[PDB]
């Protein structure tokens, strides 16, 4: 039968994250690189495409025998989890990353946080002439949490590849912790931690009690 598994987790930030929105021509003294933001509530957001693409390129460094020249050249362990534009059977592959929408706007407002983004002023210094050039880039503040969820579907075409996939999913989250996930991370942004790893079966009949202990 057809089943689905939902992955509740809190993406708690450290060294607050930058996921860029428009490179459109800013105002004169305004923020130069703004973070991506929700249109209704104007909170920060992590799109599911960043969580998918960064984890795709991180797991492409672990679960590929041959170095992939392109995402279609990825492995069969990864094409079934992230989809493949060229395989006939691994097109639309078994994971639906969703966005994340700043769950604790009340915990952060219980503390003395004025706005849910900070703006760090910053500059570059030329090698000759040592002449400064400032930027103002925006980043979602440090103690945020984000409601993360995946919808892993089980379509009976695997039948034993289910628990092989969580050794890839949990490995990918463990890599996302150690890598940065988003924007200028070599200057130390991003640095996400994953909390409250919880698998629930929202459709079908599948038991996840042997799966949460893999998630610990």
């Amino acid at each position: 039968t057809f089943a689905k598994i939902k992955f509740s987790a809190q993406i708690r930030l450290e060294t607050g994250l930058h996921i860029g929105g428009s490179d459109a021509f800013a105002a004169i003294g305004a923020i130069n690189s703004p973070v991506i933001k929700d249109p209704i509530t104007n909170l920060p957001i992590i799109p599911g495409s960043s969580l998918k693409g960064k984890m795709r390129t991180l797991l492409a460094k672990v679960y590929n025998e041959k170095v992939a020249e392109k995402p279609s050249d990825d492995s069969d362990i990864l094409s079934r989890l992230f989809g493949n534009s060229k395989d006939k059977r691994f097109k639309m592959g078994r994971l639906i990353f969703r966005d994340a929408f700043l769950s604790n706007a009340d915990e952060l407002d219980s503390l003395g946080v004025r706005s849910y983004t900070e703006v760090k002023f910053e500059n570059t210094i030329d090698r000759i002439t040592a002449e400064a050039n400032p930027r103002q880039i925006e980043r979602a503040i440090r103690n945020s949490t984000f409601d993360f969820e995946l919808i892993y579907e089980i379509t009976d075409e695997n039948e034993n590849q289910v628990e092989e996939d969580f050794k890839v999913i949990r490995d990918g989250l463990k890599l996302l912790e150690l890598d940065y996930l988003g924007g200028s991370g070599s200057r130390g942004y991003g640095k996400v931690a994953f909390e409250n790893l919880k698998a629930t079966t929202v459709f079908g009949n599948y038991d996840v009690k042997t799966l949460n202990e893999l998630l610990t």
């Binding site: 105002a27 004169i28 003294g29 305004a30 923020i31 933001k37 104007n42 706005s115 703006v119």
Partner: protein
């Protein structure tokens, strides 16, 4: 007063009404007003223009009240900023904010002043 159709033109014709250095012929027709006495005033309205896009106007009225303090103070220190904010009626544009739309209009006006200050000299 400034409206949505003419706030850039007043900032154009107010840099042109600000008197320049008539004497001291070393790149003449330079302004008495310096750039860094003007980027400080824009440094307030730029960080209100970026907070007005998110926060409601009934949460920014602590900073909007202090723009009226800072323009007065920076004009009281140097005569060139006084000659700015009396030529360009900034203290009479700060009197009329009252919502997000006129706030962002004034914050774009303060940027158009700086753009035309950079463009001339």
């Amino acid at each position: 007063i400034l409206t949505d159709e003419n706030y850039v033109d007043i900032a154009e014709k107010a840099i042109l009404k600000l008197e320049r250095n008539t004497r001291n012929r070393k790149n003449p027709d330079a302004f008495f007003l310096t750039t860094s006495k003007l980027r400080n005033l824009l440094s307030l309205t730029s960080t209100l223009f970026d907070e007005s896009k998110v926060k409601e106007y009934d949460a920014l009225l602590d900073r909007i009240a202090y723009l009226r303090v800072q323009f007065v103070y920076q004009a009281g220190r140097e005569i060139a900023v006084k000659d700015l904010i009396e030529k360009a009626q900034i203290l009479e544009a700060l009197k009329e904010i009252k919502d997000r739309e006129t706030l962002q209009r004034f914050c774009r006006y303060m940027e158009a002043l700086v753009a035309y200050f950079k463009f001339y000299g």
